[PDB]
Amino acid sequence: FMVSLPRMVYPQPKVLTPCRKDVLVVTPWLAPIVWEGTFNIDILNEQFRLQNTTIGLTVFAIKKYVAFLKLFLETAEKHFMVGHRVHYYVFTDQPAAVPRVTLGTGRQLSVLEVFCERRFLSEVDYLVCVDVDMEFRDHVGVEILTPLFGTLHPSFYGSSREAFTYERRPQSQAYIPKDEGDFYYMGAFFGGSVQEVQRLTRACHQAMMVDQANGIEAVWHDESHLNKYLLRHKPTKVLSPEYLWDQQLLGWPAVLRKLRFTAVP
Template sequence: MRFSSNIKLYVLLLIVGIFLLLGYVYFSFFTERLNRDTPVDEDQKSSSQSKPMVRSRERNMVSSEKLLYKQPSVLMGRTDVVAVTPWLAPIIWEGTYDPVLVDNIYKPMNLTIATTVFAVGKYVSFLRDFLETAEKHFMVGFNVRYYVFTDRPHDVPSVNLTQGRHISVIQVPGSNRWQEISARRMEIIQTTIESQISRVADYIFCLDVDSKFHARWGAESLGRLVAVIHPGYYEQTRDHFPYERHPASMAYIPMDEGDYYYGGAMIGGFVEDVYTLTKICRNRFEVDAENSIEAAWQEESHLNRYLLYNKPSKVLSPEYLWQDFKAKTKEVKVIRFSGVIKNYAEVRPNV
């Protein structure tokens, strides 16, 4: 009787084992088939395989009790500009946000913002004004880490920084062509995110050094992926945008496509999102180079291609990227960041 019971137990265990084995084989086959049949964007696939470690940033929009600020309205506000994109991303203009409320929400988060600038060759002469004006207007009250890429580290000026703000100087090679300097910017930002920035920063802004801050640039600019509208084309239609129009280029945008023309002097967002952008733009740039193609406006052309199909979650108005030679228009109430007037023949190795 005992022997018969043991046989029944063994048979039962054997049957259970067979069912488990068949289930495992079926599940493995189904999963493999699903993965094989699901299309994957190659750019996104390659970038996801080598994404750097990043810090968690999921936070609630918490404001203090008894905070006094102007009551918002759904009926009153700016009517001379559009403050939202067709995909519902905010466009940041003066008068479309409350700086008191924004600061109250974001400053307690203890965020760190990485900021990259390239001061290669004679462009190092713009670095002092950039840093000194940034200390007055850029992300005041936040932790900021400046990353200065230069071939002249000994010419980097000493600037007084407020508490929680630091400068890292990273030596990079110079070049006889400014186009090559522009081309390598995406690569250098990508590799620096991998090696340094991803470990210490929540957000990153990549800015042009030949510029100065003139007014507040704060937490209203923070977002997952942030772009800025080029001041020279915000009044133009897409057929006048200087997109890359040659189909052979990886930066190609057809004549009947395009949202805005974004300036290459500012890229921003979560560290991992900017990492993906720089990696994909770099790869596309290198494909063009292998085919002896140089896009119309180098990295800016590839940036616009990327942002057309990977929509920014926040768009900054031309207030955040003006040009000193342009007169302020009625729509631009405040100039926050502006490219300085310069003689390109004096500062560029080639024109």
């Protein structure tokens, strides 16, 4: 049951005026591709707040990677789902090394040493899975929430499918031939409902175990399998490279109005 939105004043959408004329904003299976300018964050914030949405953000910080936690968490506090309920899950081998970061109200952090994944189902509505050696530089909000989403890898968004670095050996479960494929998604940023995210990770785990039993390891490991999964189970939203960038390596192209989540130099 979705409650009614309140009266809101905002620019009327124009039917005969395309959103963005420089990029594809919807996939062939009718999934929005999220770019700046395609969404009114005020309307979306209302919709999700009225649902008392809770977002779980998971990160794995092992060994030297624990050093990236402070900047990651501090910037997430400034740009990630601000205004909504957020639960951070930090999986690490050094629980005592997790920095004490000051959190805004309605936000919490759980340190799990490497639990019952069934806990996710009762604690959050959506799960966002990212790499820790990153920092938020701009808004990353509810516009990304949907049953299942993948993010366009910043190095291949303009590449043809034959150039995608998919696993090309038919002996692997992550195999994708040259005439197949929509996009090349990066394994560093994906998510969706708890149910869909667990289905994806469960599928990846089983496929990788099958490859190991067969004596093969996909070219890009988990990412190869992520791409195979998203090819056969189309994501309900696709995030543009605005959500996963590396300015040192790729600069700042005009097509990117905002650089929201970037690699740390």
